[PDB]
Design a protein around this ligand. Sequence first.
Ligand SMILES: C[N@H+](Cc1ccccc1C(=O)NCC1CCCCC1)Cc1ccc2c(c1C(=O)O)OCO2
Ligand SMILES: C[N@H+](Cc1ccccc1C(=O)NCC1CCCCC1)Cc1ccc2c(c1C(=O)O)OCO2
Lengths: 149, 149
Amino acid sequence: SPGIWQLDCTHLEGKVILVAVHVASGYIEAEVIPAETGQETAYFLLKLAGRWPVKTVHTDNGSNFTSTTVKAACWWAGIKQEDGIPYNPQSQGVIESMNKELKKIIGQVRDQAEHLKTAVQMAVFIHNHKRKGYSAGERIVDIIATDIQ
Amino acid sequence: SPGIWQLDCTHLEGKVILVAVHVASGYIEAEVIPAETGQETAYFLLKLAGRWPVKTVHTDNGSNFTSTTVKAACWWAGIKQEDGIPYNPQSQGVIESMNKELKKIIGQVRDQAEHLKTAVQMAVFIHNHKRKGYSAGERIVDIIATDIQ
Ligand SMILES: C[N@H+](Cc1ccccc1C(=O)NCC1CCCCC1)Cc1ccc2c(c1C(=O)O)OCO2
Ligand SMILES: C[N@H+](Cc1ccccc1C(=O)NCC1CCCCC1)Cc1ccc2c(c1C(=O)O)OCO2
């Protein structure tokens, strides 16, 4: 579970926000892209796995599951590519909630930047620092450190 | 010590690679940009600080030290903006070496992507996973987790 991430795609202002959630902590990375392609998703995964020890990715849809570019990135970075079927029905609800919370933070910061990408990065910052008392940022670091030991 | 990062700018193929180094571990983040501007540097810092607990940034040059956009990003993300003066002369030598090693990895992966940005992310991945037997990736996590406890 320290190595499991879930991909998530949401829309705002005619653009796409691509999100990876570290499942055990709720810590997130996110980027704005014009549209979700195999290439964009493969590139995002490569960035993510250079930064965190990514063992498993649950892809956000069947297109990214199927995508040969996505599979090439997962091969490259040593990631086990998995489906994102919520065999646990609570998974749908956790992600739906996260999308709504992210969008609310984006709306709270939206006037502090011209570009959506800036607002989304501000939202990422606030989400990962929010104490719920540990933050998601602290949780992921603790989970991975325990693992290394 | 857990919160100290150093900005570093290097060139390749007529483009700019902006690097942040976590000093205590040697762990890096990097991006390709067409030129180093205040806005690009500010945006990169905002991404960095949503991801890692960034307390201090030693900026890479006086322009970025001076830049009001960079100061705005550091204010935003709660970062102390500092100069990068190598009062310890071993600092220039560490960065120069890091730049040469990154450029060497990029040349080794260069044919595996059309775009420089992809090669640079492959280089980031390889750098952070390289065991020296702990990796930079393992050191940053252990250092930050030790600090949290
Ligand atoms: C040039 N604008 C001016 C601006 C315009 C409108 C509203 C607020 C501001 C403003 O100064 N906000 C303060 C924040 C600036 C970001 C760091 C945190 C403080 C900001 C900016 C800088 C760098 C970027 C941007 C943007 C963007 O506007 O999206 O997009 C990609 O790299
Ligand atoms: C479309 N190209 C094809 C290609 C072209 C030339 C040489 C090798 C390859 C190739 O297949 N590389 C193997 C894989 C290595 C891990 C990453 C996934 C590709 C790859 C690619 C995908 C996504 C991107 C890119 C690029 C890029 O070429 O820079 O740039 C921004 O998002």
